[PDB]
Amino acid sequence: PYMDEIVTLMREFWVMNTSIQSTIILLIEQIVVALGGEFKLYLPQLIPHMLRVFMHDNSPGRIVSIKLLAAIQLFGANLDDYLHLLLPPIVKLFDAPEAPLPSRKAALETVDRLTESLDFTDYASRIIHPIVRTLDQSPELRSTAMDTLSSLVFQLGKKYQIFIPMVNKVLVRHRINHQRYDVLICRIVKGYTLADEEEDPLIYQHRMLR
Amino acid sequence: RADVELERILAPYTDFHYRHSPDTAEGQLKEDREARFLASKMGIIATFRSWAGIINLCKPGNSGIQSLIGVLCIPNMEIRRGLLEVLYDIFRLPLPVVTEEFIEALLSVDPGRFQDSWRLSDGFVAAEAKTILPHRARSRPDLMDNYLALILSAFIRNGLLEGLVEVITNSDDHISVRATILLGELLHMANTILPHSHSHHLHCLPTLMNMAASFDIPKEKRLRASAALNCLKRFHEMKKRGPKPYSLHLDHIIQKAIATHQKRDQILKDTEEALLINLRDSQVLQHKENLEWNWNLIGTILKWPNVNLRNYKDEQLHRFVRRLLYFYKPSSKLYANLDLDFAKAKQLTVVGCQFTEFLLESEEDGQGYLEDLVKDIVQWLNASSGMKPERSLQNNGLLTTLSQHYFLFIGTLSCHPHGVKMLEKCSVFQCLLNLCSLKNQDHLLKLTVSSLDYSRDGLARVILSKILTAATDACRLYA
């Protein structure tokens, strides 16, 4: 009953750059745990404030965004009708060379970690394009970007098979040998079974959990 | 009479407080209501399958179908949980399991769910393939579709779709999931059985659009309607996939069929770096024991486009194949004794077939490691079947262990032209031909029928002919 005023109260006092920034973020992490599934009733009310943090942030190293990215991972399956407007801000953080390296590191981590409880089959063309142009631009992000990409190839079935020529050009040019990605491509090029390919990721997650 | 005789069966559901007997014991008052619901439900189903009852219950004026649908919108939990079970049986839809999450309930309605009749004791592949593969008739009328088309149109005319929307967004957590599945099933049933005219007002849901993503309505109701569409969205993917094979015997049959229909319609460099780095990560050399190797990295080495023990003549790869050969040897009791319900049973069985195909690729080199493997399988058959001077009581061990997953190893070898030739040298066709006349063993004859590949000519169809004419009557029925 009192959540309506708590969200409204946080609207006025959450200024973009002031001392009271982290305590607002820390309150979000404690709030989402309390509701634990019904937080989607109040999540969109604070999205507009949260959106303008990945481009308007003067903190050194974008620490505020990093402390905010770690809070998005706790949402899990709460956001289902709001991912289309919250994910493009996330994909905008690691495709910018001028961004600090620690900020770009967390942007890749928060995608594969969020994959464990959400479906990104629809959000394929939105985030794959920055990944393929990051493996060649940054020689230091190759190790961590493959983990995000490999964790996304697992959800996709044989629809990724057409993307092999698009990705293999980077691999042959820069000699990228990822063990997990090597396993996934083999099962797609050459058949493994029939009930495993083109499988709904949410069904698989429920099966493993039980 | 007009509207009081036939409509008596609808009283238990339409009346929230129904007393059939004026004088009855109060001890089983709670159980009396449940008995009335079960008996009345069968009456409603029975009168909806006869033309004399469909018309009388669906009269244009005041009719009993509108009362049955109208009482569904009332927020009563006891009636709603009963009427939904009636609707499933009227359209003959499989009931989901009781839960509060859509994913668990969705998995309980897939057409490819396992059934007891698919076991080896029952119809092995014949029963399973009937419910998975589609009927080979595209123009024969299906009279049962006509019956469902008329029944479905009658409920839509009276407003079944509008009633379901109210139930989904205004009921309990475990009731909305049942209604969501029912609504999804009807939409799938209606887009391929109803004509064009009935589909103009079908996929619209005018009442659902009223409760949409708007701030005017209560926020809790707003997301329930939005979440219902999201939950119903995943139902489309399940029907898109369709039924899928559950057993590797049927799975290999479909794979070879599409493979031979695509070869008539006329990837990596794999340097030494790729193998040695991956070979050391397989753990099959340093830790000479099973349950320790990483089985994910083993299949990749085998079914990789260029490495076939011939292009890359490496001593280390010779160790790799011989080390893995010892595991799958029937004589070496390391694989044949695994339980049928082993956690990695599916992955281990695939790799075994994935390994015998790898050896056949190196015909000149891998035959040395392949000749010994097939020979020990033949020696294993002479023990379980009992043709050789040995006890034939090993039937119990065959059923409960993974020792039955050896016909897949020999079935996948007959597919290739150079595999059937190898069988002649090992003389496994003669062993299969001899065991056709076995009265005591029936499960062994079922496995060999659904294992060989009959695409080409040769002795593959010769053994099949003997089974279907010279065998037990029960065995020939399955053939």
XYZ file of N, CA and C in Angstrom, chain A residues 4 40-42 45 80-82 122 168 179 182-183 185-187 190-195 197-200 202-203 206 210, chain B residues 101 103-104 107 215 219-220 222-223 226 230 233-234 241 244-245 251 254-255 277-278 281 296-297 300 303-305 347 350:
180
model
N 3.436 3.241 -3.397
C 3.118 4.318 -4.329
C 3.805 5.618 -3.929
N 7.678 -5.296 -10.851
C 7.349 -4.746 -12.161
C 6.204 -3.744 -12.097
N 5.406 -3.769 -11.027
C 4.333 -2.795 -10.867
C 4.857 -1.378 -10.683
N 6.097 -1.221 -10.218
C 6.666 0.091 -9.944
C 7.988 0.336 -10.659
N 8.174 3.381 -13.330
C 8.090 4.731 -12.786
C 9.461 5.342 -12.523
N 9.828 -7.534 -18.251
C 9.480 -8.264 -19.464
C 8.920 -7.359 -20.550
N 8.140 -6.344 -20.182
C 7.594 -5.385 -21.129
C 8.392 -4.090 -21.183
N 9.519 -4.013 -20.474
C 10.336 -2.807 -20.433
C 11.768 -3.058 -20.890
N 14.522 -12.692 -29.191
C 13.998 -11.546 -29.929
C 15.028 -10.426 -30.013
N 33.089 -15.510 -38.411
C 34.336 -16.217 -38.677
C 35.416 -15.308 -39.249
N 36.990 -21.797 -26.137
C 36.629 -23.202 -25.975
C 35.118 -23.399 -26.007
N 33.647 -22.862 -29.419
C 33.992 -23.952 -30.324
C 33.006 -25.108 -30.191
N 32.546 -25.380 -28.969
C 31.594 -26.464 -28.753
C 30.250 -26.133 -29.391
N 29.358 -24.096 -31.886
C 29.293 -24.049 -33.343
C 29.285 -25.458 -33.929
N 29.992 -26.395 -33.289
C 30.055 -27.760 -33.803
C 28.683 -28.424 -33.792
N 27.912 -28.224 -32.722
C 26.586 -28.826 -32.635
C 25.605 -28.223 -33.630
N 27.091 -29.395 -37.598
C 26.817 -30.821 -37.712
C 25.820 -31.214 -36.633
N 24.834 -32.025 -37.012
C 23.725 -32.295 -36.117
C 24.149 -33.057 -34.876
N 23.455 -32.771 -33.775
C 23.638 -33.473 -32.512
C 22.395 -34.270 -32.137
N 21.239 -33.615 -32.074
C 19.950 -34.265 -31.857
C 18.889 -33.467 -32.607
N 17.623 -33.737 -32.299
C 16.511 -32.971 -32.847
C 15.700 -32.233 -31.795
N 15.542 -32.798 -30.598
C 14.782 -32.146 -29.540
C 15.569 -31.056 -28.824
N 17.876 -28.792 -30.587
C 17.967 -27.625 -31.452
C 16.644 -26.866 -31.471
N 16.744 -25.543 -31.599
C 15.582 -24.655 -31.651
C 14.675 -24.860 -30.439
N 15.294 -24.965 -29.269
C 14.578 -25.181 -28.020
C 14.357 -23.850 -27.312
N 13.189 -23.702 -26.703
C 12.863 -22.474 -25.987
C 13.766 -22.332 -24.770
N 13.544 -20.567 -22.031
C 12.861 -20.538 -20.742
C 12.455 -21.936 -20.295
N 12.069 -22.796 -21.240
C 11.749 -24.177 -20.899
C 12.991 -24.906 -20.399
N 13.827 -23.862 -16.791
C 12.935 -24.504 -15.831
C 13.289 -25.974 -15.646
N 14.631 -27.726 -12.086
C 13.877 -28.809 -11.467
C 14.437 -30.170 -11.871
N 2.744 -21.068 -12.356
C 3.661 -20.563 -13.367
C 3.286 -21.139 -14.726
N 5.246 -21.586 -17.396
C 6.255 -22.432 -18.031
C 6.053 -23.894 -17.652
N 5.800 -24.164 -16.370
C 5.575 -25.540 -15.939
C 4.326 -26.124 -16.584
N 4.864 -26.870 -20.499
C 5.609 -28.088 -20.793
C 4.769 -29.348 -20.632
N -2.871 3.735 -17.998
C -2.813 4.151 -16.602
C -4.185 4.426 -16.002
N -3.305 -0.405 -11.891
C -2.004 -0.851 -12.381
C -1.852 -2.364 -12.277
N -2.383 -2.966 -11.211
C -2.279 -4.413 -11.055
C -3.017 -5.144 -12.170
N -3.560 -3.863 -15.121
C -2.902 -3.531 -16.380
C -1.817 -4.542 -16.730
N -0.991 -4.920 -15.753
C 0.110 -5.834 -16.032
C -0.357 -7.274 -16.203
N -1.219 -7.579 -19.730
C 0.025 -7.547 -20.492
C 0.822 -8.832 -20.310
N 2.115 -11.920 -22.939
C 3.480 -12.434 -22.933
C 3.500 -13.939 -22.692
N 2.205 -15.557 -25.723
C 3.136 -15.451 -26.841
C 3.999 -16.701 -26.962
N 4.488 -17.221 -25.833
C 5.334 -18.408 -25.861
C 4.581 -19.649 -26.322
N 7.320 -25.275 -33.289
C 8.262 -26.389 -33.282
C 7.593 -27.687 -33.713
N 8.521 -33.477 -31.598
C 9.919 -33.806 -31.816
C 10.214 -35.201 -31.290
N 11.186 -35.895 -31.884
C 11.512 -37.248 -31.422
C 12.011 -37.252 -29.986
N 14.959 -40.885 -33.805
C 15.698 -39.699 -34.221
C 16.636 -40.005 -35.383
N 14.782 -40.305 -38.850
C 14.433 -39.054 -39.513
C 15.673 -38.389 -40.097
N 16.797 -38.451 -39.379
C 18.014 -37.794 -39.845
C 18.502 -38.387 -41.160
N 45.736 -28.354 -28.158
C 45.141 -27.528 -27.112
C 43.836 -28.145 -26.626
N 43.007 -28.627 -27.554
C 41.724 -29.210 -27.180
C 41.889 -30.610 -26.597
N 42.582 -30.656 -22.960
C 41.434 -30.223 -22.173
C 40.357 -31.291 -22.053
N 31.695 -32.569 -23.134
C 31.397 -31.502 -24.083
C 32.511 -31.350 -25.111
N 33.767 -31.428 -24.669
C 34.909 -31.256 -25.554
C 35.265 -32.517 -26.329
N 33.154 -32.528 -29.904
C 33.665 -31.541 -30.850
C 34.871 -32.078 -31.611
N 33.288 -35.053 -34.307
C 32.521 -34.534 -35.441
C 32.962 -33.128 -35.832
N 34.253 -32.972 -36.088
C 34.831 -31.750 -36.623
C 35.162 -31.948 -38.099
N 34.965 -30.926 -38.942
C 34.913 -31.176 -40.396
C 36.152 -31.828 -40.989
N 23.883 -38.150 -23.576
C 25.114 -37.633 -24.162
C 26.099 -38.755 -24.467
N 25.022 -40.714 -27.703
C 25.256 -39.978 -28.943
C 26.725 -40.048 -29.342
